[PDB]
Every structure is written in structure tokens, then in C-alpha cells.
Design a protein around this ligand. Structure first.
Ligand SMILES: [Ca+2]
Ligand SMILES: [Ca+2]
Lengths: 167, 166
């Protein structure tokens, strides 16, 4: 239970967060921007929904949602997109657990193998460690620049790194 | 200085370590095997030098040594490769610092911007834990499994989930 229940959760929370919780007015306006002849391409699905993840993650979510609906073209109308959206913002637990399951179940057989499970466990941990690292790096950068470029050239030079290290 | 120079020190050691210091015997031998029509591909520089770190680290390193020499083709003759080897193999501080600087300096303008600096700090902090995480994942996976699939059917169902978290 203890470490396993919390690891399923970690994975759920991760997918939920990559999808995000943008309201319909923001998703629809992006649709308006992204659509061509009234239709949203598969490749723009992540951007339309306001997703956080990789391109590949966005497209795989699209296919799991399409697959579920019997949609086989790779193009969505506003009404279809809206129906994909309704599912993804239903923040109910059953609903979220369902969408997570389908997302992690890449071959859509209604089972999850050791491989599928590890896949999403690794992605989520590693993407989360990367985001954290980039916030820190950002703060370490500001400190280096603040110290080696107090006069605000917008850069530092070789000479400044020497000094920083030889000392 | 303290935390500031440690941050910069650690990026310099990360790059130094990823490059390694194989002897010429080894790298020339590897060249001979990796070479095609006399030249060595950018994509094969890492393997030839014996670096660790990512394929991306290897090609960035490559590019930085090329930029320095105005080499714009993505291929090296043996001569040229040996020259790249010689700069890399010089573990004198002056030289190591230069190589580091040029690696961080993606546009070779002799200047390091905030953006360039954030990038090696991120990478020097990131690289190592990928595998460390890939290995924690296996310990979790094969623990989710040995608990949601006690008899080892090989898979988990939605209702195994339903019951897990409810
Ligand atoms: Ca499956
Ligand atoms: Ca630069």
C-alpha cells in the first residue's frame, strides 16, 4: 500500500498537471487561433488545451481521447474539441483515474504491463526533477550574474570566470 | 563567491569529467573503426574520444572545438581529430577553463549570457540523476506489480487501481 498507493497518485497528479485546468474561454480562443477551415489538427491539440508536457505527450493524450470516441481523422471541429476538453477538466476522481489509465495504456488493451507503468513513473519523476532543477539553476544564474556582472553588461567574460575560480 | 564559485566550479568539473582522458592509442584505434571515407562524423566524436554523458553533450563539445577553429563541415580528417584530441587531453587548468568557456559559449562571441550560464548549471545538476531515477522507477514498478498483481499474471487492471486508491 503505502509506497505503491503514493506512487500511483504521483503519476496521476503528474498527468492532471500536464493537462492543466484552463477554463473554456481560454481553450476556445486558442482554438480560434489554431484552427484552419474550422478544424484543429492533432499536432495543435496540446497547445489548444494549454498542456505543459512534451509534444509527444500531447499527441498521445489526443489519440487516447480520439480512440475512446472512435475518431480516426486527425482533425477536430470546435464541438469535438469541446467534448475532449469536458473530459479533461472533469476533475472528478473516477474520471481522472480513467483518463490516466487510458493515457498510460499506450496500446489500448485495457491492461497495464510493467513497461507502461515504469514508463510513466520515470517520465513523471524525471520531468519533475528537471523542472525543480531549472528553477534552482535560474537562481544560481541570477547570483552569478549579480556577482560577476554588477554593472549589468548582460554577460560575463573569461576574465570574470578566472577570478571567480582562482579565488 | 563561496556558493557562487562552487556552482561555477562544479560545472567545470562536470564537463572535465564527461570528456575523460583516454590516451592517444585508444582514440586513434577507435577512429580507425568509426571513420568512413577517411573522415569522422560529428555523431561519432563522443565515442571516438571516450566521453561519457549524453550524445548531446558529445556533439556540443564537438561543435565548440569546431567553432574555435572555424570548422563548419560536420566531419573531421584524422589530423583535425588529433588536434581536437590534443586540446581536450591537456588537463592544465588554463586550457580546461578555455574549453569549458567555449562549450558554454554557444555563439562563440566570447561572452556568457544568463541564458548560456543557466544551461550548463542545469545540465551539470541534471545529467547524473536520469539513471538514478530510471532505477528508482524499476524498484517502484516491480513493486506496484508485485502488489497489484500478487500472482504475477503480468498486468494491472483499472479495477486494481479503483481498489488501490479507494
Ligand atoms: Ca496496455
Ligand atoms: Ca556567448
Amino acid at each position: 500500500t503505502k509506497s505503491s498507493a503514493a506512487v500511483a497518485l504521483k503519476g496521476l497528479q503528474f498527468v492532471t498537471a500536464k493537462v492543466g485546468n484552463d477554463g473554456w474561454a481560454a481553450v476556445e480562443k486558442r482554438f480560434n487561433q489554431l484552427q484552419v477551415d474550422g478544424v484543429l489538427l492533432r499536432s495543435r491539440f496540446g497547445k489548444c488545451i494549454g498542456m505543459d508536457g512534451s509534444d509527444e505527450f500531447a499527441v498521445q493524450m489526443f489519440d487516447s481521447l480520439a480512440r475512446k470516441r472512435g475518431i480516426v481523422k486527425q482533425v477536430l471541429t470546435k464541438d469535438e474539441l469541446k467534448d475532449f476538453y469536458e473530459q479533461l477538466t472533469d476533475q472528478g476522481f473516477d474520471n481522472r483515474l480513467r483518463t490516466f489509465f487510458d493515457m498510460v495504456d499506450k496500446n489500448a488493451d485495457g491492461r497495464l504491463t510493467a513497461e507502461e507503468v515504469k514508463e510513466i513513473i520515470a517520465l513523471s519523476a524525471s520531468a519533475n526533477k528537471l523542472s525543480k532543477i531549472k528553477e534552482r539553476a535560474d537562481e544560481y544564474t541570477a547570483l552569478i550574474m549579480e556577482e560577476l556582472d554588477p554593472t549589468n553588461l548582460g554577460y560575463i567574460e573569461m576574465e570574470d570566470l578566472e577570478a571567480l575560480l582562482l579565488q
